């Protein structure tokens, strides 16, 4: 019995900032999705193009698991066809997305009383991300007609900003860990199936 290593994804010690979202390739294993869907710890579990109760009856060539941290009010952006700073500049799903979006509140682990500022998001970008594009660039963003010469200043912004998570914040400003499972269905041999 070679189960898919979901634990390595969902219980990873550290989670990426959303701008630097991580992706794991899941192949050649048996996936018991029902353990995930039946887990109450998940505040969000939304599937697209498949039904979550029937996941254990389907086979895919590959599964991808993207993971990162965002704040509560932004979880709604992790869906096809959405707009906003996360959907436009940090993590973009395709319109034809087939998969599941899973999230849970991580205030107890990602907030700290002095405020935790290690988690970052991109606040400025010259164009919207293409689907599954990943931008890790740090160049000063030129908001006006004056070039920035790589220095921050008036209309010249560092493009990444910290969330600032402290446990006292409202739910919409608390940290959420997110895992997005992408189900690849090509017409090649399947390598990830349910039991």
């Amino acid at each position, epitope marked *: 019995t070679n189960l898919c290593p979901f634990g390595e994804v969902f219980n990873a010690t550290r989670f990426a900032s959303v701008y*630097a979202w991580n992706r*794991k390739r899941i192949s050649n294993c048996v996936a018991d999705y029902s353990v995930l869907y039946n887990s109450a710890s998940f505040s969000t579990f939304k599937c697209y193009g498949v039904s979550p109760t029937k996941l254990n009856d389907l086979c895919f060539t*590959n599964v991808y698991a993207d993971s990162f941290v965002i704040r509560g009010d932004e979880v709604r952006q992790i869906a096809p066809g959405q707009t906003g700073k996360i959907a436009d500049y940090n993590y973009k799903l395709p319109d034809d997305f087939t998969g599941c979006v899973i999230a849970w509140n991580s205030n107890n682990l990602d907030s700290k009383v002095g405020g935790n500022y290690n988690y970052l998001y991109r606040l400025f970008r010259k164009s919207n991300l*293409k689907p599954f594009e990943r931008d*890790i660039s*740090t160049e000063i963003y030129q908001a006006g007609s004056t070039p920035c010469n790589g220095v921050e200043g008036f209309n010249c912004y560092f493009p990444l900003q910290s969330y600032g998570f402290q446990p006292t914040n409202g739910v919409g400003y608390q940290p959420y860990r997110v895992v997005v499972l992408s189900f690849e269905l090509l017409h090649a041999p399947a390598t990830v199936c349910g039991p």
Partner: antibody
Framework: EVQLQQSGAELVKPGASVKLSCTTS????????MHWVKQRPEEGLEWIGG????????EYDPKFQDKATITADTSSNTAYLHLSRLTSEDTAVYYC??????????????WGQGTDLVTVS | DIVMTQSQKFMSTSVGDRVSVTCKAS??????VAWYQQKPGQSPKALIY???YRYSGVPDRFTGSGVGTDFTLTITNVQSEDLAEYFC????????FGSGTKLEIKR
């Protein structure tokens, strides 16, 4: 603009070693993998290996594992390629490149300008 | 080893026309395919990831297509600055590159 800046072309004696560098401007290498690729006119492009700058783990094509060593310094945002006991087959342009994703393999979005290594006496 | 074969060593076209570059993988690679442009004297530049996604900033006249073993890079409204060698790459198992297709412009 993002730029991977490589060190200059090198003349290397047969049997000797050389260390190439690639310094990134515009992103932090700790957010991706850094790879090295070899190019020659007739043999084409060949992946040598790549490194995970977070943990220091490097991996190589088996054809290169005994003579290539890839290292990284996150504090100076620099990746290095060490080649040992060079022969004429090591005369080539060596490129540094960064990866798109972290956690799994992906394409290489950014490439350095290349470093010509010539092996001769 | 997964071998990526580009059977076309050269292709010719005119400014404004379109051309399609072909790549065949020796094994199924799904969509773990990228395309790169290399102008003479310069390093490769990334054009396509995941077989058919274009990076931000890449002109929309570059399109990638194909799944499995057969892949195509299509260039429409060809411009003189597209003079380059075009290389496919698979990253499904390690990393291997095609042998490159050099574009020639008729004028």
């Amino acid at each position: 603009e993002v730029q991977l800046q490589q060190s200059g072309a090198e003349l290397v004696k047969p049997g000797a070693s050389v260390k190439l560098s690639c310094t990134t401007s515009g992103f932090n290498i700790i957010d991706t993998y850094m790879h090295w690729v070899k190019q020659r006119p007739e043999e084409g492009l060949e992946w040598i290996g790549g490194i995970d700058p977070v943990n220091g783990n490097s991996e190589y094509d088996p054809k290169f594992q005994d003579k290539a060593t890839i290292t990284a310094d996150t504090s100076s945002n620099t990746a290095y390629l060490h080649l040992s006991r060079l022969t004429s087959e090591d005369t080539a342009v060596y490129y540094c490149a960064s990866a798109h994703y972290y956690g799994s393999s992906s394409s290489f979005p950014y490439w350095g300008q290349g470093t010509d290594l010539v092996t001769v006496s | 080893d997964i071998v990526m074969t580009q059977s076309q060593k050269f292709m010719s076209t005119s400014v404004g026309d379109r051309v399609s570059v072909t790549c065949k993988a020796s094994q199924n690679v799904g969509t773990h395919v990228a395309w790169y442009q290399q102008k003479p004297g310069q390093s490769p530049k990334a054009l396509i990831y995941s077989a058919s996604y274009r990076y931000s900033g890449v002109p929309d006249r570059f399109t990638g297509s194909g799944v499995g073993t057969d892949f195509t890079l299509t260039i429409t409204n060809v411009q003189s600055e597209d003079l380059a060698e075009y290389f496919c790459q698979q990253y499904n198992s390690y990393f291997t590159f095609g042998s490159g297709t050099k574009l020639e412009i008729k004028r």
